[model samples]
Target: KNKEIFLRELISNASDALDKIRLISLTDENALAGNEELTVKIKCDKEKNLLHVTDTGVGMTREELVKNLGTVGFYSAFLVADKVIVTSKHNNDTQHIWESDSNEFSVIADPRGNTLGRGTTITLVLKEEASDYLELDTIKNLVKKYSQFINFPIYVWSSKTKTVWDWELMNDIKPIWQRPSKEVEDDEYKAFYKSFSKESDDPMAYIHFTAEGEVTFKSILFVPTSAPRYIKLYVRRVFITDDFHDMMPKYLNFVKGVVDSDDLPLNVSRETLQQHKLLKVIRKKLVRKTLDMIKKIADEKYNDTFWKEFGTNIKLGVIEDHSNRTRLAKLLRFQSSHHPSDITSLDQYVERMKEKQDKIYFMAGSSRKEAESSPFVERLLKKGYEVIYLTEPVDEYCIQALPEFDGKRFQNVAKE
Candidate 1:
């Protein structure tokens, strides 16, 4: 079967183990053990036909060993390997080594003593055919696909010359949105967008904020150059899935970026987490931040680019998200009698409204000229009241969804 996935499972287990060790350090000072750098490593000995995955995480004791494996993380190694060897050290006990063939297993105290003050290392005795995994490129590529963004640093053995080798560090990118938004620099914001979003042009706009309530999560939302719809999810720095459709409303689908939460349950499978009740709360907060991010855009950029490309999304949101209809209405923009080319937002239209005019007037047609020439707009033009041109097909529906704008009712020229 798909044997490569064995590596993914191994790495995921290593991350969990790594997180456990860190959480311990947060509580006990003696648990520190020493100044050893906590990390994960993959090393292969082609001569011995052995492959190793090591993590400086909360390692196992003999009693704990009796409790955990054949659980896929360890059993998975058997998919490609004939034998598995696990060496672990715990703060409470001496170093132990456990060996398991596909059928039998045995445990013994490691004679080498404690090289790992606190961590576990699993070495795989790759099968004759599965030895393809022993290659540097094979391990490197697999690491990138599954565990490239793992919480702790992951290293793979690299040969510098014919005889020389080193454990080369693999992951460098850290979660940017996890920290305070103010401390993050502008250049990093753009660079992070490129790194994650993969969009060449800089983001039109982005917002980073932390939400706290039923579930606590930090998110970064970006408005792309054209239009793209996605929200990548992460649980405790582990990349989960971006294929989530419910994370962003269909109307505001142009937004892209990541949402990371430490609140999710690690025990449940990723598939199960999607149905978790907390997603509804996360979805709600994302929309609020997205709307807030859009609102923060300067009028110059909002009108120049965002409005031109994504104005319809806000209009559609007005029609779709009734809870945010009022907020969405504020972002609406349209061509009006105030200017021929530039679009005017509802706020600008309200400000320039003629005194005593309690109705906001608009005319709809396929084109601006058709809307301007409508017989119903003649009187509004004659009276010096501005008439908004509802040229796009969605324009009228959007306006109809809005009950009123700034205490004034919408008078659609074609409504009569």
Candidate 2:
């Protein structure tokens, strides 16, 4: 039905406005100052059967009106209304108005003067059948479900009170990620991680790192105290995708982080990254910092909190990071048959081995119990061999990436 489609369309419109605000805010100080954040305000007029969604963000000029709104791509009001009007004022241009009657469009200098200091407003003449859009309940739910986590201060033009007009703040949580790490307290981080990721439990791990060598970036990475149903990513402060393989190392894909870099310049295409020398440097720093953050999880906390959620990822890193395999191996934590139900690292495993033990013993199987009981481990277990269990899907491959740990070879029990 058109119901779902119409809702999708409206949300899509909201996304576009957000994109414009973010794109223009990067370079234009005036534009960024006017609306330091992005918001989509919705209004409805019963008498005129008109609905409006306005944004206090990078607005369009006369020529831009013709270029952006004159076209059919972004101006989807035609799908619901026969007539549409947009009023905008940019820092470089005077107040202007653009109107369209579905087929054609026209622009005029603002007659009422520049009321909107800086922003774009889309006025929709709602069709008779779309009157349901004006319902307050419907609008509130739409905002909560679709745009609640948007990095902005969304507001509604409310006239319920008899006093002067006021824009009701729709989104309750401030864009916490935009603030510096020192400014945010521990409670703030917990609230934000829960709010943004919608996790039932508090984050088991989180790190805030400002990278400067290559791309000059600020990044906040969080490990959901509990596993999330999905993962997401942002590039240059814009939500590129959650479905990226390279956003985080494949092993660390379950991780969530917002990465904003000053050195990356968005091209006309708007999708591909610029292959600059700085890009490689930025990438290297990002990965190294990430690994360091993971390493910082207090040993007790790491065993108690992190291992239950993403221990598999670290083992995968051992396989995925050939160059950093040694470092990743040091960071790897696991439970060995020799250790009594506690987690152990590769270094610990090596230290606990017999004085002349040259091989790192590990067993890969359907389960820890099965690996311990396997025929391959029969001899090692009999001869006091301490075998590490490989329970995760990628545990095998991760171990495969590393040939040895501290000059001691990794001997997979499965191979024998």
Candidate 3:
């Protein structure tokens, strides 16, 4: 249980280090070799019962000595170490050392030549109570549990080769969503999904297309192998939040994808964006391309592979993307009592909408039992109106967005 504390501390330190470098790099390219590949390295010295966690990120300056000591206290490292040494080197200045022995501390210029290019090295003298943490399995499990999603590579020292070799690449996949779709391979895409989403299964369907016109962008959208508990959002490759209702259209909320746009206007803070007009155009174009891409999925692929995973996102798009509702409605797929597990499209549903039925019939509810039992469906069911049961949660939103499908309006049986 105590080991977990160490794991959390290590991650918090790494994140703070990474954040410092990122913020500074935005203004000073020389802060560190811009391409140094931000990373964390861990080394254990059994002889001294010491542990070191180092990072290739912004390091504290001489003036930052007190703050450095403050962080160690904030992290509660004094609980595990009688003494600690934090050595940092910045490209702008010479290496400096900050040392502490719980009671007091001192700062001094490094006697050795500049070794660390630009980053901090924290050396911890483990107490006898925590010495068991020196075990490899203990460190590895903690890393896999807490630091797996970290943006940078994290490596632990291993003697398997009795020599230092690069450990397994921790930050394995470059976010392909940031790259042009044409540049990524099929396996790379699958590997990214499995790794980032931590899923063992392959996706049911996905669409990769470059959005052109107003905002000129590239994106890769996916229908996961299963309905996700929720969705997430990112900006400039940083995790923002899933809270944005506009990150993607409402229907696309369930669609997990990355939209990387060039020339996105940002305010001076670089945090908030400006010029929402361009975003609207980008949205319009994206939905159109997404619909076309889904339409082209081979029938067998659509049914056996794609729709099973993501048919619901399309259903939502019909409701969420009102301007493109009719366009998206045609892409909706659903299970019909008449079709078994087989799915039917809006076009097909309309073609079979009972001659001159004057409207498309839909039933929405928490489950198939509730939807199929609705009184409104009684007339349609008796008339053999080919009722489409929308047992899925997003069904109503999709139908509402349609306004009318195939020149006829939708009548919700649940409301009846």
Whole-model lDDT, candidate 1?
Answer: 0.83
In model 3, state the lDDT of residue 140.
Answer: 69
List clashing residue pairs in candidate 3: none
TM-score of 1: 0.64
Give lDDT: candidate 1, residue 151.
Answer: 59
How many clashes in each candidate?
A: 0, 1, 0
TM-score of every model versus the real structure: 0.64, 0.61, 0.59
What is the Cα-based lDDT of residue 53 in candidate 2? 73
Identify the runs in model 3 with alpha carbons over 4 angstroms from their true place: 1-20, 28-54, 60-86, 89-117, 122-183, 230-245, 265-267, 272-315, 334-343, 353-358, 362-384, 390-400, 411-416
Who wins the TM-score comparison? 1
User: Which residue pairs does candidate 1 place in steric collision?
Assistant: none
Top candidate (lDDT):
1
Cα RMSD, each candidate = 9.2, 7.6, 7.2
Q: How many clashes show up in model 2?
A: 1
C-alpha positional error of residue 188 in candidate 1 after TM-score superposition, expressed in Å: 1.9
TM-score of 3: 0.59
